[PDB]
Amino acid sequence: GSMEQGFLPKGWEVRHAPNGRPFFIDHNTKTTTWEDPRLKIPA
Numbered sequence: 379g380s381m382e383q384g385f386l387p388k389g390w391e392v393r394h395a396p397n398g399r400p401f402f403i404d405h406n407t408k409t410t411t412w413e414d415p416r417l418k419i420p421a
Contacts, residue, residue: 385416 386392389406403410 384421387419387421390415 392400
């Protein structure tokens with residue numbers, strides 16, 4: 379369904395770095411940071 383279509387807020391995307399850690403990028407304002415929106419955003 380649409381669960382795999384939206385893990386993060388609209389515009390946000392998770393990417394894995396060589397070290398194996400996931401960083402999150404906001405395509406909206408082009409903001410990239412190390413956080414876990416899933417632990418804060420109750421979607």
